[PDB]
Design a protein around this ligand. Structure first.
Ligand SMILES: Nc1ncnc2c1ncn2[C@@H]1O[C@H](COP(=O)(O)OP(=O)(O)OP(=O)(O)O)[C@@H](O)[C@H]1O
Ligand SMILES: Nc1ncnc2c1ncn2[C@@H]1O[C@H](COP(=O)(O)OP(=O)(O)OP(=O)(O)O)[C@@H](O)[C@H]1O
Ligand SMILES: [Mn+2]
Lengths: 441, 437
RNA sequence: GGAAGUAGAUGGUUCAAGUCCAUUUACUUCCACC
RNA sequence: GGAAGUAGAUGGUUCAAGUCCAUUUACUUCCACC
């Protein structure tokens, strides 16, 4: 179909209906009656206050403005007090900046404490720009909300919406800025296509520039990269998505895909067809927030992956999963088994004193001469990748992030092959190996 | 036994006995008589003519002299004809410069044609320097001819004596030059220790030097490297050898130990203990002289070894063997079997046009992005180093040396596992695998 | 918590470490959690 | 026959390989067979 019609149909996927808006307005009225009764300085920020929220994804943001003089400790104490005071029921978990998550009249709320500033240049808390963002966006976003919703739909469906470490994709606010910078979803997509990894997009200045890295300049604070946590890979995924959408437009880009329930039998065959070593490390999930788990999970992966590569097991790709009570670290290797013996470089034949030291050692085989250098044969303490990481992880748990490294210490195991296939990691496995035709809807 | 007491014993193995020399002088008188009777300018050279041959292996060198006017061909025709005429039973097989190998009274003989030059500069024939070697070295070795004999046995018990491509070792002449430079086998051994690949020995002026690479100058032709064919590794073996002898001297350094008969069962265990892929390419041996063969076996093997590495089989070492009718290229590999899928590198996402082509190629698995750029899983054609070289040797036979290549082109088998060990390549596997029993 | 940078200092590995594998002190950043 | 080198001519691989795998024509050495 023509791109214009594909977008009209996409709007039914991304615009909240009056069921949900009603439910939000009267959630807003209640929240206000409560906060007013409490006589506190507050301000509605975020997608709800600018009507740029997606269908079925409503969350109201209430900011409480405290005096700049307040300590970090007082900011916490009162923040949570009011937040608790104001919600039908609540929940407190945060990685660094304190807030309370909760519900009023069946709708989700974040009540967040912050400092009231005259300038967002220099910032006490980490969220101090948010009420300035809104003030910047408030007038400039009007009548473009649906463009925003389209871009947020396109992103979510394609798994790259959100700046959190779990996603490392596009923040909601980044979406709003882009729509402001580019006019419309379509125009964002059409331009997105020629973003290099060095595209600097200075919204306030209306400029596109070449810099050291991809960088969206926060209108509100110039030092701030709005896309600071957008992975170079997700940037790439996005520009590819754009190029692909404009060749062949489709409502598909706006509907999300889901892993297909794949038989432990079919992927037995797939793995053996590939003939690779695939195994995971299974360990108990440290009870910490998402934004803390995921970097350490990434870290754990890199470290073993690198261990695997300097040990010549020739790793391909790595992935991870965090279930309810377990985390897995998945790997695939080209080498299932390596020989016991390997080569070690020795001193040049002339360097007498070091040659002395080099054959000093007790070795099963005699060292030889090659291209005018001594060389030895020595044994490996392991010959398969599973054996390797079993050893690596046992002795190097410390280096695997503070919390997983500790959970791995208390207990970890290796699962490989069919045993591993009855674990809730198949989706990653499929994804990791580039398995075709295993996603749907 | 002290230092000099080891050269004493060795003398019986290096100096020719009563019988051996006496069979020479008469086999020499017999030779002058036929050659004179033919009326040729000829002159005796080499180890026998300088009383510098090792006991047991004697070879008389006779040089036919000719005017410079003779064509490349003319030199060759008379050279062979006079040769055939002079010897008893005789043999011709050479790689470039025509000589004739034979037997007289019972001993082995070489008769080589060459041109009578004024000076060994712009040397016409290949071997023209030999008379001019003799003319300089005769009167400078008169009495120290037992210092070469000690050096020769030493190097020949170590299989690193002989400049020919099967040995890449020390030339007989070079050893003679090491005595005239140093004065004694022992002193030669002393300095050897601080020899480097950077060494330039100048016999002409008697001066050690750190020039280009290793270079023993010929005082007869300054531009010759008398050490031209000594390998870097074979150098390395001699200099380590001399370090070992100096610190712990033995007669064992003169005994030629006979390549261990390690049973086919024993190393099947060692190879399985090492857990490595160890196979050989077996093919019919081309009917060519050694000097054209061994360089081709070197090349053949080098090329396959380099294939192996670039194919991620992680080879350790290689070796080769020439038998009656067969040749063997041996390899050992860390990887017995590699996965079927591998990674091909794509282009950076920004490059729309190359990304589009890279994605258009039919594969079995979705390509992915990693660290900015596209990557693709691809299926290998072979999963074992054996399947590997079968495929390589099949297609690249021509790059594997002129003749060995032709031979591989006709036929070869890849032998490994149980079948390999019952073939005449065990000696070479031990050496290659660094075995001690 | 993660990442980055600066000035360190230890361990282990190697014939050989400022470089490889870990550890740790000090300091300046940044990101995520809104 | 092998190797080092100067001046080009292709062919395969690959998204791209003037850089990977090969091939080829000249002129230039050099080594082994003594
Ligand atoms: N990573 C971030 N970078 C910049 N601003 C942020 C970030 N996270 C939150 N904010 C600010 O806080 C506001 C509320 O953010 P929140 O995480 O509640 O999502 P949102 O912007 O409301 O959009 P949506 O609800 O559609 O995901 C944002 O509009 C923005 O001003
Ligand atoms: N590669 C070489 N380089 C220089 N000179 C050589 C070479 N090969 C042979 N010659 C010359 O030809 C002569 C005869 O060589 P031949 O191959 O018969 O052995 P040799 O040097 O006489 O010693 P032996 O016969 O004891 O091994 C030598 O004395 C030497 O002068
Ligand atoms: Mn929100």
């Amino acid at each position: 179909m023509k791109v214009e019609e594909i977008l009209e149909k996409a709007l039914e996927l991304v615009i909240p209906d009056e069921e949900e808006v009603r439910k939000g307005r009267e959630a807003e009225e209640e929240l206000r009656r409560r906060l007013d009764e409490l006589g506190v300085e507050y301000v509605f920020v975020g997608s709800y206050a600018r009507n740029t929220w997606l269908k079925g994804s409503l969350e109201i943001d209430v900011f409480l403005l405290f005096p700049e003089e307040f300590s970090k400790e007082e900011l916490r104490e009162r923040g949570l007090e009011i937040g608790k005071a104001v919600l039908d029921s609540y929940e407190i978990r945060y990685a660094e900046h304190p807030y309370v998550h909760g519900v009023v009249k069946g709708v989700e709320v974040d009540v967040v404490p912050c400092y009231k500033l005259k300038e967002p240049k220099n910032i006490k808390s980490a969220v101090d720009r948010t009420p300035f963002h809104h003030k910047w966006l408030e007038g400039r976003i009007k009548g473009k909300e649906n463009e925003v919703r389209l871009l947020k739909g396109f992103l979510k469906a394609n798994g790259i919406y959100g700046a959190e470490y779990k996603v490392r994709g596009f923040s909601g606010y980044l979406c709003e800025l882009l729509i402001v910078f580019y006019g419309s979803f379509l125009e964002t997509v059409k331009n997105a296509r020629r973003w290099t990894r060095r595209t600097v997009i200075d919204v306030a200045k209306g400029e596109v520039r070449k810099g050291e890295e991809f960088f969206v300049v926060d209108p509100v604070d110039e030092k701030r990269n709005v896309a600071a946590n957008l992975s170079l890979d997700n940037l790439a995924r996005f520009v590819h998505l754009c190029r692909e959408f404009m060749e062949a437009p489709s409502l598909g880009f706006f509907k999300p895909k889901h892993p297909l329930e794949i038989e432990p039998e079919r992927l037995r065959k797939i793995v053996e067809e590939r003939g690779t070593a695939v195994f995971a490390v299974k360990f108990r999930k440290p009870d910490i927030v998402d934004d803390n788990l995921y970097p350490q999970l990434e870290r754990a992966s890199r470290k073993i992956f690198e261990f695997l590569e300097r040990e010549n097991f020739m790793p391909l790709r790595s992935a991870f999963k965090a279930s309810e009570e377990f985390c897995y670290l998945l790997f695939e290797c080209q080498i299932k088994e390596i020989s016991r013996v390997f080569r070690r470089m020795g001193p040049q034949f002339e360097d007498e004193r070091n040659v002395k030291k080099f054959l000093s050692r007790n070795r099963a085989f005699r060292p030889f001469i090659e291209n005018g250098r001594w060389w030895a044969f020595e044994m490996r303490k392991f010959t398969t990748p599973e054996e390797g990481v079993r050893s690596y992880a046992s002795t190097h748990w410390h280096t695997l992030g503070k919390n997983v490294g500790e959970s791995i210490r208390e207990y970890f195991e290796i699962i490989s092959g069919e045993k591993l296939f009855k674990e809730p990691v198949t989706a990653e496995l499929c994804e990791m190996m580039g398995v075709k035709d295993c996603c749907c809807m």
